[PDB]
RNA sequence: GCGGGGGGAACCUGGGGAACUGAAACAUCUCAGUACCCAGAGGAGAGGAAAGAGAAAUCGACUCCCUGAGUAGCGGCGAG
RNA sequence: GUGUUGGCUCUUGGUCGCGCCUGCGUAGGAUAGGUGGGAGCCUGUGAACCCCCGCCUCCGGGUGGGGGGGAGGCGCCGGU
RNA sequence: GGGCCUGACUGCGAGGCCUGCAAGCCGAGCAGGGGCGAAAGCCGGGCCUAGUGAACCGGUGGUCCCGUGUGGAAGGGCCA
RNA sequence: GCCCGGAUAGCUCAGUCGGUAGAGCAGGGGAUUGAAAAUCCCCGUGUCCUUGGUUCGAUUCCGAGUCCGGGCACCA
């Protein structure tokens, strides 16, 4: 009955019985971890699809405001103005088909892929080969191509986190800091909570959103109730 | 008259029969079986005070045996 | 039940002709043309089963 | 100290309840709940004040006559 | 099947809920079951050094515990 | 024998073949709409006379007509 | 017209809960061989029915297609 974990002072905090709610949740988890550095508490959660028959395989993006700093990197793949739009908005890897080129050698540090339509074709054939079965290549309806690049890489700072259910249909993201700000990663799980509830194809009978949760990368993993 | 029930009348009738079905299904009735039955119940009792029975009839039997036993 | 089946012409949702057809030689093959109602005259399509 | 029982041409209530013939065969169907066995209250019983009708912010116990269409319809939608 | 047709009981199967507690085609300090958060984590072992003991196996190893004490280890970093 | 293409079109037809019934059968020409020529025009299956079956019943693709107070609906009317 | 199973070596058929394709027989090759055998070693071939998506990859996982096998129900 005694396991392998110091982190058993915070299992002690960790009372689950109850699924309580996300408020309560931003509370007792900014408490719950400060370790090294400051907690990088995540969401993450479960659906009941099928991502096999890819009528249903989702993500995109909400707008979890916030202010913003961490979590999901992408690429702004372009040319000089839209670098400029991108780049400020808010971006981790920034430039063009040149980066393109950069990756197709052994350059890639972006999860998500922004390219807007004037490098488009180059990102998408060039790197397609490259970024492919990894969810790194743009895709039309995937908050990934577009020539807004400012913009969406802009929320990404503001504040991006995206949405894309894993092989067995669960997605995760950022929706509040540690000593957070709270609200914040609040608020932006929200924006997912939504554009995401929209997406839930009508192909859907029962249990959809099943799991959904905040995790961080290398950390903690604890399932949200979006309700609340 | 000797069985009817004790606790009212379920002494009598029956007209029936069947063939077959497949309607709300493929198509119409496979209609026929001129057919003509009985259809009823059960026995049993208990005690007055030291000697007795009851005969009776199923359920109105149950809640009635208990009816008398309140007496 | 021979590989003479019939099939009819339905056109791009807007509509649906009829007429029966075959098997045989090309089998599936399908497409065709026709004319519905639709509009006025319009490609239609064929094929369904 | 009471009651019944026993009758009774037809009418009558319920009890149980059939082939013909039709459907130019005939198995659903049909004659029909008809014939007949019965039990029983009458002088007539039957039914008899609405968990009704019907849709108009309408009627108003029950029974029998005329009408309601033989239409509304029931169905080897056929005899009927 | 179900109704009278009540009592205790040995037990065995399917199913879904959670745990293993678990996950070894191959380069992979290494038996990575995924996909998330994601460079830090921790000191009721004062430690990865050592000790046995509990448990699951495809040599290894993974995991859960009792102790033994003297700022240490590992995740990072990199790398496959 | 070669090229290009769907009319083996929907709406329909006047007026005739034969026939008592129902059948089956012949068809200029008007409309929408196309296709073969540049066009004078042919094309509403094949070179023609056999490859055929009422009525019920029920299915499916409509439709979006009907619904037993009203909204819908089981269900259902006409088309294919 | 529904409901289940399969599709693999020439034959009959195994087959990770995604990393290799394997039996048994047929066929062939040597020793043995009054002798037939049995023995006895050795091999041979694979879009794993087809088409796409999941995954770093997939015989396998899911959809769809064709086929064969099973079954169960009606039929004016």
Sequence with gaps: ?228 | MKEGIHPKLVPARIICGCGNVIETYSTKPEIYVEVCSKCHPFYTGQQRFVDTEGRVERFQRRYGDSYRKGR | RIKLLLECTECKRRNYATEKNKRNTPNKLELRKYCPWCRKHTVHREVKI
């Design chain 1, 1 to 228: 009955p005694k396991h392998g974990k110091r982190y058993r002072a915070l299992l002690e905090k960790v009372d689950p019985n109850k699924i309580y709610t996300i408020d309560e949740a931003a509370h007792l988890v900014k408490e719950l971890a400060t370790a090294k550095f400051d907690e990088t508490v995540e969401v993450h959660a479960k659906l009941g699809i099928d991502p096999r028959r890819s009528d249903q395989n989702v993500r995109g993006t909400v707008s979890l405001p916030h202010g913003l700093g961490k979590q999901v990197r992408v690429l702004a793949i372009a040319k000089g103005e839209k670098i400029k739009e991108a780049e400020e908005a808010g971006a981790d890897y920034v430039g063009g088909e040149e980066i393109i080129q950069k990756i197709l050698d052994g350059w890639m540090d972006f999860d998500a892929v922004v390219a807007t339509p004037d490098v488009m074709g180059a990102v998408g054939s060039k790197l397609g080969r490259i970024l492919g079965p990894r969810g790194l290549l743009p895709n039309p309806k995937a908050g990934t191509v577009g020539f807004n690049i400012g913009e969406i890489i802009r929320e990404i700072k503001a504040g991006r986190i995206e949405f894309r259910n894993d092989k067995t249909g669960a997605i995760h993201a950022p929706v509040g800091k540690a000593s957070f700000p709270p609200e914040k990663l609040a608020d932006n799980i929200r924006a997912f909570i939504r554009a995401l509830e929209a997406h839930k194809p009508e192909g859907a009978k029962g249990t959809f959103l099943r799991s959904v949760y905040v995790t961080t990368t290398m950390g903690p993993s604890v399932r949200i109730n979006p309700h609340s």
